[PDB]
Design an enzyme around this catalytic site. Structure first.
Site, short mmCIF file in Angstrom:
data_model
loop_
_atom_site.label_atom_id
_atom_site.label_comp_id
_atom_site.label_asym_id
_atom_site.label_seq_id
_atom_site.Cartn_x
_atom_site.Cartn_y
_atom_site.Cartn_z
N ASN B 8 33.81 19.98 -17.64
CA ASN B 8 34.61 18.84 -18.04
C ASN B 8 35.18 19.21 -19.41
O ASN B 8 34.57 18.98 -20.44
CB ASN B 8 33.85 17.50 -17.97
CG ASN B 8 34.70 16.32 -18.42
OD1 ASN B 8 35.92 16.46 -18.72
ND2 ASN B 8 34.09 15.16 -18.54
N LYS B 10 37.45 17.72 -20.94
CA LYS B 10 37.76 16.52 -21.72
C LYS B 10 39.16 16.68 -22.37
O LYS B 10 40.00 17.30 -21.66
CB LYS B 10 36.67 16.12 -22.74
CG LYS B 10 35.32 15.91 -21.98
CD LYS B 10 34.34 15.11 -22.83
CE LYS B 10 33.00 15.07 -22.05
NZ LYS B 10 31.99 14.38 -22.94
N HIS B 92 33.48 8.41 -15.35
CA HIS B 92 32.92 9.05 -16.55
C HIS B 92 32.67 8.00 -17.62
O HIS B 92 33.40 7.03 -17.88
CB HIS B 92 33.87 10.13 -17.12
CG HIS B 92 33.15 10.96 -18.18
ND1 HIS B 92 33.10 10.60 -19.48
CD2 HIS B 92 32.46 12.13 -17.99
CE1 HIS B 92 32.41 11.54 -20.09
NE2 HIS B 92 32.03 12.49 -19.26
N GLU B 94 33.04 7.99 -20.74
CA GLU B 94 34.12 7.65 -21.71
C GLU B 94 35.11 6.68 -21.02
O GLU B 94 35.64 5.87 -21.80
CB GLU B 94 34.81 8.83 -22.33
CG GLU B 94 33.86 9.74 -23.12
CD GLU B 94 33.91 11.17 -22.88
OE1 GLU B 94 34.73 11.85 -22.27
OE2 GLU B 94 32.83 11.77 -23.43
N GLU B 162 24.60 11.23 -15.87
CA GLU B 162 24.81 11.57 -17.26
C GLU B 162 24.45 10.43 -18.17
O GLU B 162 25.23 9.49 -18.44
CB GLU B 162 26.26 12.00 -17.55
CG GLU B 162 26.93 12.80 -16.37
CD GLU B 162 28.06 13.68 -16.92
OE1 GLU B 162 29.10 12.94 -17.22
OE2 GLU B 162 27.97 14.88 -17.13
N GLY B 168 27.27 14.66 -25.55
CA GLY B 168 27.76 15.26 -26.78
C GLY B 168 26.87 15.06 -28.00
O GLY B 168 27.31 15.36 -29.13
N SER B 208 24.64 17.26 -22.78
CA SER B 208 24.21 18.35 -23.64
C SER B 208 23.52 19.50 -22.95
O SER B 208 22.51 20.03 -23.47
CB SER B 208 23.39 17.80 -24.80
OG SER B 208 24.13 16.85 -25.53
#
Lengths: 245, 245
Positions: B8, B10, B92, B94, B162, B168, B208
């Site tokens: 990903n 991003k 996702h 985000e 996730e 992150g 991560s």
């Protein structure tokens, strides 16, 4: 003020049909006195810029407020420039009302895109209920202020007035209702920014512009061009580009 | 279940940097047993698909739920297929927490993407406050049901767990924490869908993942691969692909 005509393709096209459309524009006789920009779906921005004649600019339909980061699904001004596109459409009615983007967020986007050297087509417009309530003015001035607060250099900014009730409905604003708002927005700029800014900033109209409509709208003194949706995907887009001729 | 590793990207890259990354990937000695997919910014899907070896799949990072229309800024499954990408990342973290995408919307995107023939990597996961309150199970099953009630054919679905607190931040879930959630999700699938769907659906971990912690996580019985963020932009992504070697 140089007449400006932008085509917002929205979420339409494939390589075949967009290839067709681009070939049409490239071979058409477009007025040298009109600045033309095509806003393509992000997946086809590279494609469009490679195939369109150089005199026609390319614009992204949206961007985020930082150059890079953890924002799955977003693109930035740096990526737009990477591809050779020179503009971005920000504050579009669909972004605001379907995707819930706020004035604050739009302002941040405008500031970033400008800092990055892109031109910005910033959209503003009242809803039907707002027009009926008679607060068209308060609504657009508030939206404009959010944009203005984040603009340092107005030379790369185009304001697009697109009443929500006129977008994709077939219900075009009359030439007199478009003129009334454009004139008031120009006065807002004159009193809140400066005379020079008001005189040079293009204020374009959007919301059901057709080959049929454009000539009468383009004759209004404060209407500097148009932001075209549905008709940008048709041959009549050429007629709109050539409205002042 | 074939081991599945997705990168990903991003909102990162340009043609120069993604070009190098791709060059590295085409030349790497990647396990013949790992299914690899790279999730590129929409502006670069065409580029990425043209450059990457056909053995590596390309995924879009988001899409809308109809083939076309007046959705300024969105892309559809039909456009994604047009470019030759074969997957989309939906739900996702985000998109959920920064962009406000609801479970209902995500479920509609899933159904449309599958109808259009795309493979889907559907993301699910709880926040730190949810974990600490003891409701991880409640939250992930609620999110999975919203997706599952919209899935007619599981052959093309990949579930990605996730945990938000691990995305992150460097706070990778321990192998025991991952295994616990994967086992429970596989359990959900078996009782709400079917045993046949439970044993063939890959459930990948993300948050991560590094070249350094991948082997331990990959030895867990219910972990079928990973969804990699930050490390997918680095050479160590090759080590993650080969986590079972």
């Amino acid at each position: 003020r140089k007449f400006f005509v932008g085509g917002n393709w929205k979420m339409n096209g494939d390589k075949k049909s967009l290839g067709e459309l681009i070939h049409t524009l490239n071979g058409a006789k477009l007025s040298a006195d009109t600045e033309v920009v095509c806003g393509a779906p992000s997946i086809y921005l590279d494609f469009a810029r490679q195939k369109l004649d150089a005199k026609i600019g390319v614009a992204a339909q949206n961007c985020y407020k930082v150059p890079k980061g953890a924002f799955t699904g977003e693109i930035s001004p740096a990526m737009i420039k990477d591809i050779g596109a020179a503009w971005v459409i920000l504050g579009h009615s669909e972004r605001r009302h379907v995707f819930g983007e706020s004035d604050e967020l739009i302002g941040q986007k405008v500031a970033h895109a400008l800092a990055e050297g892109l031109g910005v087509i910033a959209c503003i417009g009242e809803k039907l209920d707002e027009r009926e309530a008679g607060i068209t003015e308060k609504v657009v001035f508030e939206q404009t202020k959010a944009i203005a607060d984040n603009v340092k250099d107005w030379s790369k900014v185009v304001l697009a007035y697109e009443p929500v009730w006129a977008i994709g409905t077939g219900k075009t604003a009359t030439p007199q209702q478009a003129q009334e708002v454009h004139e008031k927005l120009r006065g807002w700029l004159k009193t809140h920014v400066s005379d020079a800014v008001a005189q040079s900033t293009r204020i374009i109209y959007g919301g059901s512009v057709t080959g049929g409509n454009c000539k009468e709208l383009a004759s209004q003194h404060d209407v500097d061009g148009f932001l075209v949706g549905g008709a940008s995907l048709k041959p009549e887009f050429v007629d709109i580009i050539n409205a002042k001729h």
